[PDB]
UniProtKB/Swiss-Prot annotation, chain A:
Coiled coil region boundaries: 15-55
Subcellular localization, as worded in the UniProt entry: Nucleus
Superkingdom classification of source: Eukaryota
Stated role: Component of the Mediator complex, a coactivator involved in the regulated transcription of nearly all RNA polymerase II-dependent genes. Mediator functions as a bridge to convey information from gene-specific regulatory proteins to the basal RNA polymerase II transcription machinery. The Mediator complex, having a compact conformation in its free form, is recruited to promoters by direct interactions with regulatory proteins and serves for the assembly of a functional preinitiation complex with RNA polymerase II and the general transcription factors.
Name listed for the protein in its UniProt record: Mediator of RNA polymerase II transcription subunit 21
Family from the record: Belongs to the Mediator complex subunit 21 family.
UniProtKB/Swiss-Prot annotation, chain B:
Miscellaneous remark of the record: Present with 1617 molecules/cell in log phase SD medium.
Biological function: Component of the Mediator complex, a coactivator involved in the regulated transcription of nearly all RNA polymerase II-dependent genes. Mediator functions as a bridge to convey information from gene-specific regulatory proteins to the basal RNA polymerase II transcription machinery. The Mediator complex, having a compact conformation in its free form, is recruited to promoters by direct interactions with regulatory proteins and serves for the assembly of a functional preinitiation complex with RNA polymerase II and the general transcription factors.
Location of the protein in the cell: Nucleus
Gene: MED4
Family: Belongs to the Mediator complex subunit 4 family.
Subunit structure: Component of the Mediator complex, which is composed of at least 21 subunits that form three structurally distinct submodules. The Mediator head module contains MED6, MED8, MED11, SRB4/MED17, SRB5/MED18, ROX3/MED19, SRB2/MED20 and SRB6/MED22, the middle module contains MED1, MED4, NUT1/MED5, MED7, CSE2/MED9, NUT2/MED10, SRB7/MED21 and SOH1/MED31, and the tail module contains MED2, PGD1/MED3, RGR1/MED14, GAL11/MED15 and SIN4/MED16. The head and the middle modules interact directly with RNA polymerase II, whereas the elongated tail module interacts with gene-specific regulatory proteins.
Record-given protein name: Mediator of RNA polymerase II transcription subunit 4
């Protein structure tokens, strides 16, 4: 019984090799896109940080 | 009333001063 319920849960059964080969391709792409988005964000945040830091530096007493 | 107001006003300016101090003290620990 177990071995079947597992064979049913076994992944990929229904799907084709092509229906997969593209799904991977896509994920590869949509993945680059998301990293460029990540990069950009990171930069923008660090710029924001630089801004805050500058401010804080100018509130210091001692030369 | 005027005495209240004035007392307040001075107290506030005090807090502002008190903060500027700290900034300078930080500046010291950081520079000197």
């Amino acid at each position: 019984r177990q071995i079947n319920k597992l064979i049913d849960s076994l992944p990929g059964v229904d799907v084709s090799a092509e229906e997969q080969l593209r799904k991977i391709d896509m994920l590869q792409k949509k993945l680059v896109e998301v990293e460029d988005e990540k990069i950009e964000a990171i930069k923008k945040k660090e710029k924001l940080l630089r801004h805050v830091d500058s401010l804080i530096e100018d509130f210091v007493d001692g030369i | 009333n005027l005495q209240k107001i004035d007392k307040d006003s001075e107290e506030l300016d005090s807090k502002t001063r008190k903060i500027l101090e700290i900034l300078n003290e930080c500046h010291d620990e950081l520079k000197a």
